[PDB]
Amino acid sequence: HHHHTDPMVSKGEELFTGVVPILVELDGDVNGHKFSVSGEGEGDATYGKLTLKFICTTGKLPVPWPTLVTTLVLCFSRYPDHMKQHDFFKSAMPEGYVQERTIFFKDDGNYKTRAEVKFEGDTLVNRIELKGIDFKEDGNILGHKLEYNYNSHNVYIMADKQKNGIKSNFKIRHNIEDGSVQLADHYQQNTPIGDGPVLLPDNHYLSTQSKLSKDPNEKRDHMVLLEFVTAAGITLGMDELYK
Numbered sequence: 001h002h003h004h005t006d007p008m009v010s011k012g013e014e015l016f017t018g019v020v021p022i023l024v025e026l027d028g029d030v031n032g033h034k035f036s037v038s039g040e041g042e043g044d045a046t047y048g049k050l051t052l053k054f055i056c057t058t059g060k061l062p063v064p065w066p067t068l069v070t071t072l073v074l075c076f077s078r079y080p081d082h083m084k085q086h087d088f089f090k091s092a093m094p095e096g097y098v099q100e101r102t103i104f105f106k107d108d109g110n111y112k113t114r115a116e117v118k119f120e121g122d123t124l125v126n127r128i129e130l131k132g133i134d135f136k137e138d139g140n141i142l143g144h145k146l147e148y149n150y151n152s153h154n155v156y157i158m159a160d161k162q163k164n165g166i167k168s169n170f171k172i173r174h175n176i177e178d179g180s181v182q183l184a185d186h187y188q189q190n191t192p193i194g195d196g197p198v199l200l201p202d203n204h205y206l207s208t209q210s211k212l213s214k215d216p217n218e219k220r221d222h223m224v225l226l227e228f229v230t231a232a233g234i235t236l237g238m239d240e241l242y243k
Contacts (some may be wrong), residue, residue: 054223140182
């Protein structure tokens with residue numbers, strides 16, 4: 001909804017009232033295996049909810065789909081009302097923001113990603129380039145030894161006032177089919193594309209859950225993703241209103 005006392009908050013909330021269509025495009029190269037992914041779906045920031053289907057448009061995906069979840073749109077996070085002044089991601093819209101990561105897979109290779117997230121008309125677009133190097137051919141990634149699932153996790157967000165953006169580092173644990181875990185250490189920075197002001201947040205976290213599934217009628221290599229992302233970690237207003 002639109003009704004906030006801060007007109008800067010109102011501007012960003014306005015763009016994300018209702019269901020917004022999403023397009024995702026990724027071009028990737030991991031150890032010289034070139035691939036492309038296209039995704040479509042919709043986001044509903046009121047509930048923190050994304051529903052997306054991704055297709056590998058070059059044939060078989062050379063890495064496991066779960067390793068691409070975090071790469072393949074944090075403006076759809078649900079920020080509670082008392083935290084809306086800390087929503088960097090919507091405040092950068094519609095001009096958008098850049099999201100850069102390095103992801104280190106423990107005892108394996110790394111991904112470097114750069115994405116631009118912005119509106120094209122009514123559609124929110126996430127355009128990504130991914131470069132992966134130093135992977136082991138018989139490791140868990142190029143060897144496809146990961147389970148097709150995704151563990152819930154919390155991620156801390158901090159301002160980077162020098163870059164007028166945010167930074168975040170966090171660990172993802174991917175499940176290996178033998179019951180072990182493959183760690184993926186993420187380093188992330190985001191910066192605005194426009195030159196206007198943005199909301200720089202106090203420290204807080206995002207709580208994320210994802211469900212991965214398959215489309216039984218789809219013969220192409222693909223992933224169906226339901227993702228929820230909710231902001232938390234700042235207590236109400238002046239204090240607690242219920243004591």
